[PDB]
From a paper:
The axial structure consists of three morphologically distinct regions, the rod, the hook, and the filament from the proximal to the distal end, with a few minor components. The function of the hook is a universal joint that transmits motor torque to the filament in any orientation relative to the motor axis. The rod is a drive shaft that penetrates the peptidoglycan (PG) layer and the outer membrane and connects the hook with the rotor of the motor. The distal rod and hook show distinct mechanical properties, although they share the same helical symmetry and repeat distance and are composed of similar subunit proteins (FlgG and FlgE) with 39% sequence identity.
Here, we have constructed an atomic model of the St-rod structure on the basis of the crystal structure of a core fragment of St-FlgG (FlgG20) solved at 2.0 Å resolution in combination with the previous cryoEM map. The crystal asymmetric unit contains two FlgG20 molecules, mol A (80–224) and mol B (72–227), whose structures are almost identical to each other with a root-mean-square deviation (rmsd) of 0.60 Å for Cα atoms. The N-terminal 33 and C-terminal 3 residues of mol A and 25 residues of mol B were not traced because of poor electron density. FlgG20 shows a single domain structure composed of 15 β-strands and the loops connecting the β-strands, and is similar to the D1 domain of FlgE except for the absence of the triangular loop and the conformation of the N- and C-terminal regions. FlgG20 more closely resembles Cj-FlgE than the core fragment of St-FlgE. The β-stretch composed of the N- and C- terminal chains of FlgG20 (N85–T89 and Y218–T221, respectively) fits nicely on the corresponding regions of Cj-FlgE. Although the homology model is similar to the D1 core of the FlgG20 crystal structure, the crystal structure includes a part of the region connecting D0 and D1 that was not present in the homology model. The C-terminal region of FlgG20 comes close to the N-terminal end of the C-terminal D0 helix of FlgG in the previous rod model. The N-terminal region of FlgG20 goes into the edge of the elongated density that was not assigned in the previous model.
Numbering used by the authors: 80 to 224
The structure:
């Protein structure tokens, strides 16, 4: 496995902590894939869900421009609320990617990591299944691991 950090509650909807194994998958500015535990989410200039570093989550998730709030469930379901509408509208699925050897991941800076020969191939799964951890919106993973 890898070293889990302690989950502190911030109540910020942008913060999504991972409880257990897995990394968020993002697309680097050059088109390649990277991975991170930094669940600090955002909406880029075209409604795409991105991380704190500004990197688009992979696969792409589009947030409607009229979305009032974004909810990310423990299973990774991404939904939004819209004015006067009672039911939440699901807009995407946030996946968690696991590796055989997290130590083998290469740091590329900004809390991002990429797949290496030592890390093994990525295993993309739903949060909660196949060893992948769970997502806790409003929580941060503290670096005091």
């Amino acid at each position: 496995l890898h070293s889990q950090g302690n989950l502190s509650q911030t109540n910020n909807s942008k913060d999504v902590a991972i409880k257990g194994q897995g990394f968020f998958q993002v697309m680097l500015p050059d088109g390649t894939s990277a991975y991170t535990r930094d669940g600090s989410f955002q909406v880029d200039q075209n409604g795409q869900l991105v991380t704190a570093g500004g990197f688009q989550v992979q696969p792409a998730i589009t947030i409607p421009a009229n979305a009032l709030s974004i909810t990310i469930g423990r299973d990774g379901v991404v939904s939004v609320t819209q004015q006067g509408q009672a039911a939440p509208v699901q807009v995407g699925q946030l996946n968690l990617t696991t590796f055989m050897n997290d130590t083998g991941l290469e740091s590329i800076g900004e809390n991002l990591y990429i797949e290496t020969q030592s890390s093994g191939a990525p295993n993309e799964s739903t949060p909660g299944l196949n060893g992948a951890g769970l997502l806790y919106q409003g929580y941060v993973e503290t670096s005091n691991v």
